[PDB]
């Protein structure tokens, strides 16, 4: 007990692509890397206009 700061939330260490992964802490890390690289190739609605 000599802390100077506190993390706002640990899940904020992740990036934009890795924040989509559900339960990323229950996965082997290369799988998380694969999903991070592969969700950019996912198909959806890029813009409303």
């Amino acid at each position: 007990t000599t802390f100077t700061h506190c993390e706002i939330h640990p899940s904020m260490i992740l990036g934009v692509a890795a924040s989509i992964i559900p339960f990323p802490d229950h996965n082997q890390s290369p799988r998380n890397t694969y999903q991070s690289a592969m969700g950019k190739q996912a198909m959806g609605v890029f813009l409303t206009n």
């Binding site: 934009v16 692509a17 989509i20 969700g39 950019k40 190739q41 996912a42 198909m43 959806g44 609605v45 890029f46 813009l47 409303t48 206009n49």
Partner: protein, 287 residues
């Protein structure tokens, strides 16, 4: 939902990828391999933000391996063909006595190990006992080789004022500050050589800087506007030597800045590096 943060060049959305680089004005000490004669090298990538924005690399190298006896420390000054011994630099800056030099280098009297490791430097520099002599020595090592003997002093003064540690100052009268900084660099080098601190990690993210759109566009515009103002000066010289009339519109060429910025943003290359500007990916929002 569109977030912005990108340019539209010729109707194409271009984004500037943040370019990573090593931070400037930080002293880093690195060990060297066995075959090399220098064992440890302390270097600083000196640069000034509010000036010419030029990179001048000062290196302080410790010659001789662990088993070697002649462990002389030498500095690589810019525009000098040889590695000048450090004590010569201290005497050139204006610190003649050996005790004052060692005080500027070593901050602990009891640290006799550093003094023992540093004695070869003063032994090497004993031949020069005067500031003017050291300045003449540096000028003689000067790579220009187009200066008379009595003006070599001035040339060395210019080297030690406008080229040696620019990030500290460019004016005169701050010799003591640069001498103190050189002593600090040698102190760090000797601490690393004495196995008191590990060599600096090049991968430490706190030693890295990310150039965003701001600094990148700033340096590109600095180069481009320097080109434009040189063109303005050339036009003024041409129109005054030919005694023609002077006009502002005929002087300025906005095409220079416009085309330069548009070319740097339209193509990946950043000049006149590659892939600095990339087509914004619009396959998905997260992309």
């Amino acid at each position: 939902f569109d977030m912005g943060g990108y340019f539209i060049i010729n109707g194409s959305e271009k984004v500037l990828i943040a370019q990573e680089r090593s931070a400037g004005n930080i002293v880093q000490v690195f060990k060297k391999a066995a075959p090399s004669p220098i064992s440890h090298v302390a270097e600083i990538r000196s640069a000034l933000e509010k000036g010419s924005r030029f990179i001048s690399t000062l290196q302080v190298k410790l010659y001789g391996r662990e088993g070697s006896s002649a462990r002389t420390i030498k500095a690589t000054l810019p525009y000098i063909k040889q590695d000048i011994p450090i004590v010569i630099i201290f005497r050139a800056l204006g610190i003649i006595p050996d005790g004052e030099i060692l005080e500027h280098i070593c901050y602990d009297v009891n640290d006799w190990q550093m003094l023992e490791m540093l004695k070869p430097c003063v032994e090497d520099g004993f031949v020069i006992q005067d500031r003017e002599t050291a300045l003449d020595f540096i000028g003689r090592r000067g790579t220009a080789l187009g200066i008379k003997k009595e003006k070599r002093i001035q040339y060395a003064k210019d080297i030690l004022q406008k080229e040696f540690l620019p990030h500290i100052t460019q004016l005169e009268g701050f010799e003591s500050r640069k001498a103190f900084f050189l002593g600090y660099m040698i102190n760090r080098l000797l601490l690393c050589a004495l196995d008191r601190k590990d060599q600096d990690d090049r991968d430490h993210f706190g030693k890295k800087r990310l150039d965003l759109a701001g600094p990148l566009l700033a340096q590109l515009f600095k180069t481009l506007f320097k080109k434009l103002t040189k063109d303005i000066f050339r036009y003024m010289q041409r129109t005054v030597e030919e005694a023609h009339d002077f006009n502002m519109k005929l002087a300025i060429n906005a095409k220079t800045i416009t085309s330069g910025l548009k070319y740097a943003l339209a193509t990946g290359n950043w000049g006149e590096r590659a892939g600095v500007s990339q087509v914004l990916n619009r396959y998905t929002y997260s992309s």
